[PDB]
Each structure stands twice: as structure tokens, then as C-alpha cells.
Amino acid sequence: GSSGSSGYIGLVNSFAQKKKLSVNYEQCEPNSELPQRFICKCKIGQTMYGTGSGVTKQEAKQLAAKEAYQKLLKSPPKTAGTSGPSSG
């Protein structure tokens, strides 16, 4: 394959869960009748991270993540701090 053994498309999905975050995918259609292109915006906790756009929803939603990923690596979720014997 290419662009990673699996890709970022999934990175986010697993990323959010790890950071007990909330990932959402909004689907908005282009006012203009044609052409017809699906769009999916990835929002993490009511926050705009990435936005994918393609001929099909899937293709869109997918890419969306790719953007959300890099966005995290640059600007992660400002957290206070984790601490506890629950796990070490």
C-alpha cells in the first residue's frame, strides 16, 4: 500500500477514543444543484478540526480525519493532566 500501512483515516477514530474525546461527522450538501459532491466535516467536541470533500460521502468523511489528525499533532486537546494508581 501507500501513505502508511493503514492511513490516518483511522488514526483519528482511534485517537479520539484514546483521549476519551468526542468525534462527529457533519454532512452538508452544496447549494448549487450540480455537480453532485458529498462533504463531511470532522468536528472534535464542537470544534472544527478537518473537512473532507469528495464525490462520495465515504471518500469525504475519510479524508476529513486525515486533516483532524495533523491538527491534533500541532494543537492537541488542552488537558489539565492525568494522574492515578488506577494504571501505571
Overall number of domains in the chain: 1
Judged by DSSP in three states, 72 sits in helix
Residue type at position 45: G
Which residue, 53, 71, 73, is CA-closest to 63?
A: 53
Take residue 63 and report the three cell numbers written for it.
479524508
List CB contacts of 54: < 8 A, sequence separation 6 or more: 37, 38, 39, 60, 62, 63
Q: Which helix (H) or strand (E) holds 71?
A: helix 57-74
Which residue, 9, 4, 1, is CA-closest to 54?
A: 9
Contact (Cβ atoms closer than 8 angstroms) between residue 48 and residue 75: no
Take residue 82 and report the three cell numbers written for it.
492525568
Residue span of the structural domain in which 87 resides: 1-88
CATH number at residue 1: 3.30.160.20
| CA atoms of 58 and 77, how far apart (whole Å) | 26
| CA atoms of 38 and 66, how far apart (whole Å) | 17
* 3-class DSSP string for 8-64: HHHHHHHHHHHCCCCEEEEECCCCCCCCCCEEEEEEECCCEEEEEEECCHHHHHHHH
Using only C-alpha atoms, the chain has a radius of gyration, in whole angstroms, of 15
